[PDB]
Short mmCIF file of N, CA and C and ligand atoms in Angstrom, two decimals:
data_model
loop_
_atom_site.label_atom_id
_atom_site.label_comp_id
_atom_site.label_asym_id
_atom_site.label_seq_id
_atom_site.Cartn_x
_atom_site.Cartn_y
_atom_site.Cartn_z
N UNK D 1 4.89 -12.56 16.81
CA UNK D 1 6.17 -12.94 17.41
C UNK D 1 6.08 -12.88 18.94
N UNK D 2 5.68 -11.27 19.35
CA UNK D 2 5.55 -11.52 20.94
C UNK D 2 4.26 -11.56 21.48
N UNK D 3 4.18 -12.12 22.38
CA UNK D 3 2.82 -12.31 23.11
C UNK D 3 1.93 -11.05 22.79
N UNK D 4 2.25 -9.75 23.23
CA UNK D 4 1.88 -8.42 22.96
C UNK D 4 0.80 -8.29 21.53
N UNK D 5 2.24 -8.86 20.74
CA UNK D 5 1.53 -8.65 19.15
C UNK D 5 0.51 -10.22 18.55
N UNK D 6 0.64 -10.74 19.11
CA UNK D 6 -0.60 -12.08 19.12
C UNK D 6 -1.95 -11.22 19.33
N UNK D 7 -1.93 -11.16 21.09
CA UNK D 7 -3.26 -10.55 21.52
C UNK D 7 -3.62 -9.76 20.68
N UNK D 8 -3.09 -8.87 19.50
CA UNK D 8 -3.42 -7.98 19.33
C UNK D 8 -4.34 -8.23 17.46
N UNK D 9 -3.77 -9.12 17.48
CA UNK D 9 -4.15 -9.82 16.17
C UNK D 9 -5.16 -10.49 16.23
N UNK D 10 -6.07 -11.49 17.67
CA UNK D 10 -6.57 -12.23 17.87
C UNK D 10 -7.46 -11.09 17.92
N UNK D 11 -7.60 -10.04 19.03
CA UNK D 11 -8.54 -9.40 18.65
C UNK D 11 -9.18 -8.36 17.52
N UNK D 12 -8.18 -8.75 16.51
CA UNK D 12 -8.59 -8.11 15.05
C UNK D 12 -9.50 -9.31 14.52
N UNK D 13 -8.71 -10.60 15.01
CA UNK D 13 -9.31 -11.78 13.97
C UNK D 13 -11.08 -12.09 14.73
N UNK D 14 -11.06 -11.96 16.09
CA UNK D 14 -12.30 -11.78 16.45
C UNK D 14 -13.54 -10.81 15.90
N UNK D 15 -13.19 -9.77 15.53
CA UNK D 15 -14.64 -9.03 14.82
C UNK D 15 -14.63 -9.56 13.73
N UNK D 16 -14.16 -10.35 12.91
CA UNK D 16 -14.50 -11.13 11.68
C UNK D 16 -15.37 -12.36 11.97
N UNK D 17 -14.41 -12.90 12.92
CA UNK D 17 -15.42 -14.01 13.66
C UNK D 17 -16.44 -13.95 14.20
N UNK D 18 -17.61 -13.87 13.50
CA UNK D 18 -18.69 -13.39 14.16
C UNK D 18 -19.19 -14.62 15.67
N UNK D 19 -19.47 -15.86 15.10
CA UNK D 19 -19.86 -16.48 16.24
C UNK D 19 -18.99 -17.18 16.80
N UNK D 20 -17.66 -16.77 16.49
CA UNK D 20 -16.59 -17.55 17.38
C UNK D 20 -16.05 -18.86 17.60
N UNK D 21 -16.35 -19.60 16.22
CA UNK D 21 -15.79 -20.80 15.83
C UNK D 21 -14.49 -21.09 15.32
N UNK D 22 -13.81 -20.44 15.28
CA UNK D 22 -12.27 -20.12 14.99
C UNK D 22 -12.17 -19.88 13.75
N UNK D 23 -13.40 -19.72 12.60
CA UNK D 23 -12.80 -19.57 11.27
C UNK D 23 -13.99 -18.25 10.69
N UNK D 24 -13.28 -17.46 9.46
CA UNK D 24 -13.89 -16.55 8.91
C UNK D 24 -14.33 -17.39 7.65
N UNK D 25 -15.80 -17.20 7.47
CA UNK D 25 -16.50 -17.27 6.12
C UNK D 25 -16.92 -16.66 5.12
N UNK D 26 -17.13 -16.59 4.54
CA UNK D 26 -17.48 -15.47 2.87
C UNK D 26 -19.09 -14.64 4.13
N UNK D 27 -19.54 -15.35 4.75
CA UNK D 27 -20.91 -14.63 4.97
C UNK D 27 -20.54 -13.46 5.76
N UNK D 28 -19.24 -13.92 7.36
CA UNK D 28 -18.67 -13.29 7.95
C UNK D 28 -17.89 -12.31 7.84
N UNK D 29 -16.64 -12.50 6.89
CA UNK D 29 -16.50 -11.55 5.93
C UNK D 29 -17.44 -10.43 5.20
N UNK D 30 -18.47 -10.91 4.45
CA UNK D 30 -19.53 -10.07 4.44
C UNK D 30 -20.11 -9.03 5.64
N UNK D 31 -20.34 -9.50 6.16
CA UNK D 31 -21.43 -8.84 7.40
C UNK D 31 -20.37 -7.52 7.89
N UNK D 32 -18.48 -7.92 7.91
CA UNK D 32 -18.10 -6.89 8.42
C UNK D 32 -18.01 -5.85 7.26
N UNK D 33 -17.57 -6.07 5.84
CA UNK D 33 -17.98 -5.17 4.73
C UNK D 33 -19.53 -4.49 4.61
N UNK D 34 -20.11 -4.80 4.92
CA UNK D 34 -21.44 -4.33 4.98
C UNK D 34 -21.76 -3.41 5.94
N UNK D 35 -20.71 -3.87 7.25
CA UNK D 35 -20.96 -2.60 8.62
C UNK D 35 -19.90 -1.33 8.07
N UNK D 36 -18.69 -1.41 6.95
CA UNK D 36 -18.13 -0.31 6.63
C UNK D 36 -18.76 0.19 5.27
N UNK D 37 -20.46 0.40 5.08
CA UNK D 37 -20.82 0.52 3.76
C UNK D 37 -20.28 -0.01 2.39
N UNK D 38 -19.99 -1.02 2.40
CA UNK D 38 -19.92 -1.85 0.68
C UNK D 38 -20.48 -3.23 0.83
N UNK D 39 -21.70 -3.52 -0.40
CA UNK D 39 -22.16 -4.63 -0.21
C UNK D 39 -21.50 -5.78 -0.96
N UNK D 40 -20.21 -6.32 -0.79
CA UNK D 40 -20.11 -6.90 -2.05
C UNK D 40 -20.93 -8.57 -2.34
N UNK D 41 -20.73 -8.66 -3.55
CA UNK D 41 -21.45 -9.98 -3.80
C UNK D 41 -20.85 -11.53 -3.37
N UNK D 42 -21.10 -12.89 -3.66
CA UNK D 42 -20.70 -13.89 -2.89
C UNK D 42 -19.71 -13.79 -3.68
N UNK D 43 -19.56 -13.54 -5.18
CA UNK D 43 -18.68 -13.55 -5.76
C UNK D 43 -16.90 -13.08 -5.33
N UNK D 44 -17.27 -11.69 -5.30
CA UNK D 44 -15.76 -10.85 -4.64
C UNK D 44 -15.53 -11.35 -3.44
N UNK D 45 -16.43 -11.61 -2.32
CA UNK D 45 -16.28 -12.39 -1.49
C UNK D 45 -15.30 -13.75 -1.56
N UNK D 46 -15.77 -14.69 -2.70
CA UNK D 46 -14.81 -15.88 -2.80
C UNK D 46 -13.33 -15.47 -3.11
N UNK D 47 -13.41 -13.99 -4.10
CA UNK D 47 -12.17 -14.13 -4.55
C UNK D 47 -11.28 -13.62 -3.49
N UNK D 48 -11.23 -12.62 -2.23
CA UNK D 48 -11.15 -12.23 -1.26
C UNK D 48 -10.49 -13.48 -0.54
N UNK D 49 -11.52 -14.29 0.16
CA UNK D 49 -10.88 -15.30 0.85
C UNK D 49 -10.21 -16.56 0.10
N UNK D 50 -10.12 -16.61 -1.26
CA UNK D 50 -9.37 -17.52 -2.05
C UNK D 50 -7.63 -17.26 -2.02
N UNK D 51 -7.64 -16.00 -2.09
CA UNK D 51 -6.36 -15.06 -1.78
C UNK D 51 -5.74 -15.83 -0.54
N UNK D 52 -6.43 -15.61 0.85
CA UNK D 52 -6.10 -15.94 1.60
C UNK D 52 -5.94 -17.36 2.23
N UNK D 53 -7.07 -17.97 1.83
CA UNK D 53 -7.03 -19.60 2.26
C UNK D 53 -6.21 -20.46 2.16
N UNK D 54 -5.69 -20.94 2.20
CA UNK D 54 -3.97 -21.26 1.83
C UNK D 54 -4.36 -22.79 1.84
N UNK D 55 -5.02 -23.25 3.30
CA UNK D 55 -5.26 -25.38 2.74
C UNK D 55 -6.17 -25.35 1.65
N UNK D 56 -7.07 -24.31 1.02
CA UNK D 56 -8.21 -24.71 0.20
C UNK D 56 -9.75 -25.34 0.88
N UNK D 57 -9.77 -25.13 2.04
CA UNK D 57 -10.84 -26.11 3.03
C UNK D 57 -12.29 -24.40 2.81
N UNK D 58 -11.63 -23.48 2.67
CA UNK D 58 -13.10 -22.71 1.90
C UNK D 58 -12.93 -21.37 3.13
N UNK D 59 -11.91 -21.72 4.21
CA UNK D 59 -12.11 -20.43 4.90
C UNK D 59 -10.91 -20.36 5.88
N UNK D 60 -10.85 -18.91 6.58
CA UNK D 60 -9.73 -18.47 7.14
C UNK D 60 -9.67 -18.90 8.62
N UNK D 61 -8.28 -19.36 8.93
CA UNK D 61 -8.44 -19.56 10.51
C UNK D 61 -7.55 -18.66 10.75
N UNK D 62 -7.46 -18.72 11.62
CA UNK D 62 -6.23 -17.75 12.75
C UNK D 62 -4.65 -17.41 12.37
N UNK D 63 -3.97 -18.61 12.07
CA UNK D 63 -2.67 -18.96 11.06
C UNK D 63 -2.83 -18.17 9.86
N UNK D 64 -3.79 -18.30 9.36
CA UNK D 64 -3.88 -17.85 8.00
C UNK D 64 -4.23 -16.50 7.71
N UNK D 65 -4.59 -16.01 9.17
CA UNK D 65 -5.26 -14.74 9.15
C UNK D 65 -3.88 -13.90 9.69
N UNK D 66 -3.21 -14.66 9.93
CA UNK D 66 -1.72 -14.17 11.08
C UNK D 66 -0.43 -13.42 9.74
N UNK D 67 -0.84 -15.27 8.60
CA UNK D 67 -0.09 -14.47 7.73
C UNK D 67 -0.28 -13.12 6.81
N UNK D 68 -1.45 -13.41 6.19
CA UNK D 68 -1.99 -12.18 6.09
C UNK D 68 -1.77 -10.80 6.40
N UNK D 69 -2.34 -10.77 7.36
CA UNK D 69 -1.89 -9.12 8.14
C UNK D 69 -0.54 -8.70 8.24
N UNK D 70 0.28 -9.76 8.61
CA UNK D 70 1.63 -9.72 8.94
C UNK D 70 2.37 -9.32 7.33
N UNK D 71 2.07 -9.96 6.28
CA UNK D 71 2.76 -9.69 4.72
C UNK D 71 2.07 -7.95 4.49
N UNK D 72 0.50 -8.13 4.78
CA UNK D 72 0.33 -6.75 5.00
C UNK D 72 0.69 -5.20 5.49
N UNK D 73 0.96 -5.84 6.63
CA UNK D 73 1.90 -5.07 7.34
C UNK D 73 3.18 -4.46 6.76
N UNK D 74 3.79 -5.60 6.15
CA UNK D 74 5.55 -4.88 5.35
C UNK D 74 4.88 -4.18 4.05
N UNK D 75 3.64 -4.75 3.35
CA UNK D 75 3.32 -3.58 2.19
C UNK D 75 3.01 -2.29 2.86
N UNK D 76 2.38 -2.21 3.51
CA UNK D 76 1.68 -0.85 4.14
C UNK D 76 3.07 0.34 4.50
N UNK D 77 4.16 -0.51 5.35
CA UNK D 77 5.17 -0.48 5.36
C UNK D 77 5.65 0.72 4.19
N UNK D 78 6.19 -0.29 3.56
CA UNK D 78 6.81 0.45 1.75
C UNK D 78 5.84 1.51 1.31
N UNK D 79 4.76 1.55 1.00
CA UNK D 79 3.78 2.68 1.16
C UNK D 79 4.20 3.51 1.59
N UNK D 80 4.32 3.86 3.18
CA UNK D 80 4.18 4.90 4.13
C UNK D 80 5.58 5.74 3.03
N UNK D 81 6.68 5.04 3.36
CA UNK D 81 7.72 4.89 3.06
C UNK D 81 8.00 6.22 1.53
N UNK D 82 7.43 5.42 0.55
CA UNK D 82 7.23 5.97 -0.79
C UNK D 82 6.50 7.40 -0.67
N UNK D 83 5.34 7.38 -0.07
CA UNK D 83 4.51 8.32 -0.22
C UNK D 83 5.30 9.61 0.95
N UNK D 84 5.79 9.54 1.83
CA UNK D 84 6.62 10.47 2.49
C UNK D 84 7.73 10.77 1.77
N UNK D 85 8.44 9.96 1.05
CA UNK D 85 9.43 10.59 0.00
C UNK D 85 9.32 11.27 -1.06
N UNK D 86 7.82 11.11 -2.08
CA UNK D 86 7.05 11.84 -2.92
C UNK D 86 6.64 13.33 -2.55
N UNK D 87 6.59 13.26 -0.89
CA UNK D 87 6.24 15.28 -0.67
C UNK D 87 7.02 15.53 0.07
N UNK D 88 8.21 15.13 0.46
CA UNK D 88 9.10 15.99 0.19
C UNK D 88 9.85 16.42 -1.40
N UNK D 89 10.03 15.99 -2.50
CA UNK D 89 10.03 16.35 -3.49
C UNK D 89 8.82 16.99 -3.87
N UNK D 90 7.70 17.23 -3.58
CA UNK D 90 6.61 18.22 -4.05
C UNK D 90 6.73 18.91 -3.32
N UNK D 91 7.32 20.30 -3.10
CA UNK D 91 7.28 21.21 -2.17
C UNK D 91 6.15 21.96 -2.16
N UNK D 92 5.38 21.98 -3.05
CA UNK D 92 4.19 22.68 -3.12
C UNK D 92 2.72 22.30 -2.86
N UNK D 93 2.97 20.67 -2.40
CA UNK D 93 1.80 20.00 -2.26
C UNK D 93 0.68 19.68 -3.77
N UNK D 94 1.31 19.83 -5.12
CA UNK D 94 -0.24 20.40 -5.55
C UNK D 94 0.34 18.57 -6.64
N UNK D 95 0.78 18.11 -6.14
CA UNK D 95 1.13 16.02 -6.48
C UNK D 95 1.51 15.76 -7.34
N UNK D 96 2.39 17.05 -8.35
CA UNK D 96 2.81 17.12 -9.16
C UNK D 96 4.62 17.42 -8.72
N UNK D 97 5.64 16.68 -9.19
CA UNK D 97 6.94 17.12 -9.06
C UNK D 97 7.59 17.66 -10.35
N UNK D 98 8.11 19.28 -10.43
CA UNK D 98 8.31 19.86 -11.28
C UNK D 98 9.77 19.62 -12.06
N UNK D 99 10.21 20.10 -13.00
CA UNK D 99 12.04 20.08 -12.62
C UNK D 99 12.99 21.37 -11.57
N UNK D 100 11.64 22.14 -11.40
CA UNK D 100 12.42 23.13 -10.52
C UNK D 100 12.51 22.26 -9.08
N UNK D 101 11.43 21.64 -8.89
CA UNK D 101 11.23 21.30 -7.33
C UNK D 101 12.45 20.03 -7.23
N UNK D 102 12.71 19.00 -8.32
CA UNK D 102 13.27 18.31 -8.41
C UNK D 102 14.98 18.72 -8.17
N UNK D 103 14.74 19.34 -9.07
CA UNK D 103 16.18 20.34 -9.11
C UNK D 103 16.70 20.89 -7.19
N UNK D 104 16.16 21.52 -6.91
CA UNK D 104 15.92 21.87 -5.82
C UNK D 104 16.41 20.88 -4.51
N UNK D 105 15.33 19.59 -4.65
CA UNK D 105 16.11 18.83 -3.69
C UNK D 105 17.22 17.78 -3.98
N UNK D 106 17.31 17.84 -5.19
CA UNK D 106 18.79 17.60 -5.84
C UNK D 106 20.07 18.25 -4.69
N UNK D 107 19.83 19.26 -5.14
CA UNK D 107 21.34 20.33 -4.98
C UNK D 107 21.34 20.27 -3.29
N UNK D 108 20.27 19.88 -2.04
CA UNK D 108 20.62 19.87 -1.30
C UNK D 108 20.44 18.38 -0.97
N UNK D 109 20.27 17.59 -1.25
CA UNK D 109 21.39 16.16 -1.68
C UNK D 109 22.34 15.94 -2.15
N UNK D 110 23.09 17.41 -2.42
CA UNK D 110 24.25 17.05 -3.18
C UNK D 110 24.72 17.09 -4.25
N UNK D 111 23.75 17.22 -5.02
CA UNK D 111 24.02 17.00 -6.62
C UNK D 111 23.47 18.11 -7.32
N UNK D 112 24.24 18.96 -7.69
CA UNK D 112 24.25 19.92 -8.74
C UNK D 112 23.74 19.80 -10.15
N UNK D 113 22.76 19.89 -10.38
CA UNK D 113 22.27 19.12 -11.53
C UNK D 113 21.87 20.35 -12.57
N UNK D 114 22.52 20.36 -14.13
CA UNK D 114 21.90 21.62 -14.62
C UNK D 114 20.24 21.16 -15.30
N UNK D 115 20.00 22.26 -15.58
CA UNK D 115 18.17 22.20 -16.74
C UNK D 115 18.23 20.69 -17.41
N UNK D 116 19.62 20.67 -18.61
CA UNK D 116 19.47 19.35 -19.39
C UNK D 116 19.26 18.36 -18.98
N UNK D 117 19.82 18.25 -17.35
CA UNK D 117 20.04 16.78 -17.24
C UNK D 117 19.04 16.53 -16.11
N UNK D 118 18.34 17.72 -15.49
CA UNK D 118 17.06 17.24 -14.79
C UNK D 118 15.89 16.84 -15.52
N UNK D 119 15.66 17.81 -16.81
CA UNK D 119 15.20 17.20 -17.85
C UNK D 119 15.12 16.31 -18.45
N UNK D 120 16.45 15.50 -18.68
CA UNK D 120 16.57 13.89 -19.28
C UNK D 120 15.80 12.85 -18.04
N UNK D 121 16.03 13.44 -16.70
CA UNK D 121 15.60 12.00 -15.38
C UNK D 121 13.68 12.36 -15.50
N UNK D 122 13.59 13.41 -15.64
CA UNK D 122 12.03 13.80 -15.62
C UNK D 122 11.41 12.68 -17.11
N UNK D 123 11.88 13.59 -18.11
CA UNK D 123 11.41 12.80 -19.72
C UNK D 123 11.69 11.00 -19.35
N UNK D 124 12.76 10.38 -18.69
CA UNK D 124 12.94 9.36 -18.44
C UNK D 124 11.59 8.66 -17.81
N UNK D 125 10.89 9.20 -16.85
CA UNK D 125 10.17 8.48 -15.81
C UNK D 125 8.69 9.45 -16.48
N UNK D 126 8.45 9.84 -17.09
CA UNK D 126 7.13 11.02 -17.38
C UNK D 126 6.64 9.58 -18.82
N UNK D 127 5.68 9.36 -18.49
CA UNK D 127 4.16 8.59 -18.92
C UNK D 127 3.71 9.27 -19.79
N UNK D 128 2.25 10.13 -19.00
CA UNK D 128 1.57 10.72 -19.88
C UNK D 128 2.10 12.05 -20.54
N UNK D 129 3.23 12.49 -20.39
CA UNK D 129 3.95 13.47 -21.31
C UNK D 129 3.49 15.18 -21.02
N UNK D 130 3.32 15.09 -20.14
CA UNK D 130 3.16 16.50 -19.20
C UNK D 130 4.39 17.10 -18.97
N UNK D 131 5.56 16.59 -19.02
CA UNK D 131 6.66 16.61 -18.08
C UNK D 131 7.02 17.49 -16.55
N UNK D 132 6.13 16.69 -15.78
CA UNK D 132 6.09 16.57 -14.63
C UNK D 132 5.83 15.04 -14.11
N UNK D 133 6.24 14.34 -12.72
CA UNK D 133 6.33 13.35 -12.10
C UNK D 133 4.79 13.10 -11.06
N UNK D 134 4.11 12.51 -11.64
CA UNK D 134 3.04 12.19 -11.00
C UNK D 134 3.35 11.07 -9.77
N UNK D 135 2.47 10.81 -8.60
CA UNK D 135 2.57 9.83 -8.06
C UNK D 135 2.99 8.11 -8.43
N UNK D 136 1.97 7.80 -9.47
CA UNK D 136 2.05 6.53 -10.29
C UNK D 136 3.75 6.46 -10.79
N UNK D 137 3.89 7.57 -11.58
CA UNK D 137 5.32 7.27 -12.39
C UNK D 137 6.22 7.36 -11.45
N UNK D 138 6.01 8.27 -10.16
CA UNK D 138 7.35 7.91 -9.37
C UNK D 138 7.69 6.68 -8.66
N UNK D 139 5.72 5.98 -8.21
CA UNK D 139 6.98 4.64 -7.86
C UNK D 139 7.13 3.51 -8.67
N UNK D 140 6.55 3.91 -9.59
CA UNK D 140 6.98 3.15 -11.35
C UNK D 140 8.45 3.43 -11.18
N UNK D 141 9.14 4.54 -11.33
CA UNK D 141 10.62 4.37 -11.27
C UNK D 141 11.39 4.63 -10.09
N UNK D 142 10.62 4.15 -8.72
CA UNK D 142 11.34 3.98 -7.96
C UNK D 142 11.73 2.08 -7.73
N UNK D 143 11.51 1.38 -8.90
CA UNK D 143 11.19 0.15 -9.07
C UNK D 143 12.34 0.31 -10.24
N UNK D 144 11.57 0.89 -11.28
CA UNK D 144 12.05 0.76 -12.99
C UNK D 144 11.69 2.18 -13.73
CA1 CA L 1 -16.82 -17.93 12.29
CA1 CA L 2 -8.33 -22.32 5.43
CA1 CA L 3 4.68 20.21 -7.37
CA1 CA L 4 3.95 12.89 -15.85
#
């Protein structure tokens, strides 16, 4: 949008660009996966920039690399988001949310909640049947 945040993108889209022809290729792509240790094959490679290529011409330009990061950006976003709301409900750090801990930041949100009925929202959103709130199931039902 602003000049600021261009420059700042161009020089992200430059270390992909290895020789500076305005577009990223499966090889280029490669070479920078390979400088963060993973070799992947031409294969994952295609599927990688297939994602992204949007005319179908076989590789990424600048536009395309703009949208990208930028849709990226609002996921990463929601992330941060989720995962800061998950420990504060784990008061204990150990990535498990209990019904005591639940309970807990209930009542200073407001809501007085007895055993039964923290119990019913836990059994509601609990998967593998531990009854406790793992990461996965919470933003499983912070969705559904
Ligand atoms: Ca290139
Ligand atoms: Ca393209
Ligand atoms: Ca916990
Ligand atoms: Ca569970």
């Amino acid at each position: 949008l602003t000049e600021e945040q261009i420059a700042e993108f161009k020089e992200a889209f430059a270390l992909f660009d290895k020789d500076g022809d305005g577009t990223i290729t499966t090889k280029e792509l490669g070479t920078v996966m390979r400088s963060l240790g993973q070799n992947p094959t031409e294969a994952e490679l295609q599927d990688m920039i297939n994602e992204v290529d949007a005319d179908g011409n076989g590789t990424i330009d600048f536009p395309e690399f703009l949208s990208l990061m930028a849709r990226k950006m609002k996921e990463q976003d929601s992330e941060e988001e989720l995962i800061e709301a998950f420990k504060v409900f784990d008061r204990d750090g150990n990535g498990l949310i209990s019904a005591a801990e639940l309970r807990h930041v209930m009542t200073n949100l407001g809501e007085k909640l007895t055993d039964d009925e923290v119990d019913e929202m836990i059994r509601e959103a609990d998967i593998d049947g531990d009854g406790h709130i793992n990461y996965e199931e919470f933003v499983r039902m912070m969705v559904s």
